[PDB]
Ligand binder design. Sequence first.
Ligand SMILES: O=C(O)[C@H]1O[C@@H](Oc2ccc([N+](=O)[O-])cc2)[C@H](O)[C@@H](O)[C@@H]1O
Ligand SMILES: [Zn+2]
Ligand SMILES: [Zn+2]
Ligand SMILES: [Zn+2]
Ligand SMILES: [Zn+2]
Ligand SMILES: [Zn+2]
Ligand SMILES: [Zn+2]
Ligand SMILES: [Zn+2]
Ligand SMILES: [Zn+2]
Ligand SMILES: [Zn+2]
Ligand SMILES: [Zn+2]
Ligand SMILES: [Zn+2]
Ligand SMILES: [Zn+2]
Ligand SMILES: [Zn+2]
Ligand SMILES: [Zn+2]
Ligand SMILES: [Zn+2]
Ligand SMILES: [Zn+2]
Ligand SMILES: [Zn+2]
Ligand SMILES: [Zn+2]
Ligand SMILES: [Zn+2]
Ligand SMILES: [Zn+2]
Ligand SMILES: [Zn+2]
Length: 731
Amino acid sequence: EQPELEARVKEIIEVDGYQFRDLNDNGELDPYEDWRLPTPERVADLVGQMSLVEKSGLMLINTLNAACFGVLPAQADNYINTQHMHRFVFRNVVDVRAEGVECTGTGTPVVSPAEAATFTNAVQEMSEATRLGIPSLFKSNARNHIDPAGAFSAFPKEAGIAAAALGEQARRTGEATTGDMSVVADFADVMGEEWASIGLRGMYGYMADLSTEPRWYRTHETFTEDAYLAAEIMETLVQTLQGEELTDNGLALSPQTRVALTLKHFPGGGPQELGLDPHYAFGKAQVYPAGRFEEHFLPFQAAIDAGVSSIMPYYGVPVDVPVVGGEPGETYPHTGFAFSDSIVNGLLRDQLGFTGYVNSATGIINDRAWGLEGNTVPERVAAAINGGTDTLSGFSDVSVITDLYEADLISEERIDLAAERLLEPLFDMGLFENPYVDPDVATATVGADDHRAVGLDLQRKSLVLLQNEETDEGPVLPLKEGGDVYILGDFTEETVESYGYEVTNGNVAEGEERPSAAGSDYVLISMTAKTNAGDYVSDDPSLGLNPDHGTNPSVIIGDDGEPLPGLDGQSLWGAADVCVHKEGHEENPSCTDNRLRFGGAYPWESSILDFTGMEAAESWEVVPSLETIQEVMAEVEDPSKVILHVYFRQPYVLDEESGLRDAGAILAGFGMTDTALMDVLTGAYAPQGKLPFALAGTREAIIEQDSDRPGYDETEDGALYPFGYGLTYED
Ligand SMILES: O=C(O)[C@H]1O[C@@H](Oc2ccc([N+](=O)[O-])cc2)[C@H](O)[C@@H](O)[C@@H]1O
Ligand SMILES: [Zn+2]
Ligand SMILES: [Zn+2]
Ligand SMILES: [Zn+2]
Ligand SMILES: [Zn+2]
Ligand SMILES: [Zn+2]
Ligand SMILES: [Zn+2]
Ligand SMILES: [Zn+2]
Ligand SMILES: [Zn+2]
Ligand SMILES: [Zn+2]
Ligand SMILES: [Zn+2]
Ligand SMILES: [Zn+2]
Ligand SMILES: [Zn+2]
Ligand SMILES: [Zn+2]
Ligand SMILES: [Zn+2]
Ligand SMILES: [Zn+2]
Ligand SMILES: [Zn+2]
Ligand SMILES: [Zn+2]
Ligand SMILES: [Zn+2]
Ligand SMILES: [Zn+2]
Ligand SMILES: [Zn+2]
Ligand SMILES: [Zn+2]
């Protein structure tokens, strides 16, 4: 009964034989401070006592990073006392800093697990110190995946976790449908304990988006293209991270909730047109040529039914999509999902039954109010809140919500309803009783030996064997013991040496002679492709306003009957950026798309996913360069002695002209260490993963495939490797 209670500013009061935290510091037990009453009654009493601005402060969520290790940043006082915010996004890398690190510049420091816990405890202490002592919630993007983070236990990327899951279901069933969720559960158990231990109880994620459009740069963090497998992953992720104890309101929230998920990006951010992402003005559009809008919010249905705490809608504009459960011929507003009542209030809450709160994507008011290009900031804030969005990521100006209330552009009925939905989980999660964590217990949880072992295990099972030729001497893989080995790509020489091979290193500096691979028993290449689009400028005549770069075929007709600027299907790629069309209320607006900060290629190269194409592209880079790989593969005798490990960050195309298909073995890796790849390469473990998305063999397939449809079975050329494909060793 008596829950653990910590209080560093307000004090504890004993009542009816129990102890309670006096958070209003009135000296008396208020029903909201009484942990014995149902959550609704505590909310009602708390909401009852709050000022208007106090309730408005709940509708904001903003970056609050530790600074230098783990001091509170400049804006903490302003956010907590002037804006009355209680929701923050924590973005520092958590790891052990190398000797010598001298905090300098205006970057974002690395902090140890205890330093992070110390910083988040300080924020909770500043929160306790506010008039009513409401606690704080921190959110974070994922931290547990290898970037091919810090001291968090390392796992393959999301698609690698699905690969492991599919492949373990096949090794026990001979079938790859929706996977063995024990793999996912085992992953999420490690993430939960490590996050909770630093006082990190909220997540911007995971992504339920489907990888049905291979040209979308964010396929790097999607699990799969299959709605049904996504649905099963979402279900297990919520059950493991939030728990299976549901409130009467149907939310998996207890004090035993380690991380409350904000599933993103509703209703599904996968089917972007030409793969262009709506962080940017040319990529506002989401299109559904195969009519799978219903399929794409299916994982969200599964997460909602398991009680996910929160939903983040995406920036995208759904084009000509029938309202689900509406009168025929009706379509959803051609505006960002977060501003459409039909989506946030109608689809999500009425049709899919969501009873939680809604968290906008970051920066929808100032930067990405798609469909509301001409509207003001106060107008955009009102439309988002009135459409159904309860908290605004990236907006930190509480006075705008209060001005809108006094101008009757938002009601007290709406703000109260927001306050109740945002406050509810903090209550069910037990943060009103104890919101603190032990820094020292963080140091013993984040990156524990058994946690790293579960990751390494998931790493080894994520690897997908695509190709393993049978030579005269048997299959290429596993490697035979010992030999001369050529390495190229991100291989650590000594690590490969340590398995007892004499290693020739083809990775040399620019001004240096690469040793030839001639006479090698084995060539190990580890390769990928990156975008390199940091030079992009929307209003530069040589780039975004360059007629030689073509036109943006995306058409979005505004509900008002006229096309959105730059999206009439005839305009220069850059013309959609506000710095070009200037329809806002600002003198010389800055460009939203410059430097393509978030990822993705130049929009006019978004369809170049084949390695030959990418080598030649302006804003794509093959690493190591396709030229070098091809030199190397010819210097060896039989290409059958080259083993390609490919990081398919996007469903890249092994095109026939590149010759990569001539390798004796090809593997799909979704993020792993040298030592985990070597253990599978040498046969200490057999590969058993299966593809969670299909791979194509021609650029024509990439351009023909329906952005909302999984696979390439509707194309002339079709798939090189189907979903669910993966070899193993056969002895
Ligand atoms: O990380 C966030 O805040 C969330 O919003 C979006 O990412 C942004 C991050 C920073 C900024 N910014 O600094 O302006 C803008 C956008 C993503 O679409 C979403 O997946 C993510 O969880
Ligand atoms: Zn006092
Ligand atoms: Zn009190
Ligand atoms: Zn009221
Ligand atoms: Zn105030
Ligand atoms: Zn407050
Ligand atoms: Zn990427
Ligand atoms: Zn189920
Ligand atoms: Zn788009
Ligand atoms: Zn303000
Ligand atoms: Zn009034
Ligand atoms: Zn302690
Ligand atoms: Zn543990
Ligand atoms: Zn054999
Ligand atoms: Zn030696
Ligand atoms: Zn020309
Ligand atoms: Zn060019
Ligand atoms: Zn317009
Ligand atoms: Zn104006
Ligand atoms: Zn050369
Ligand atoms: Zn497709
Ligand atoms: Zn053809």
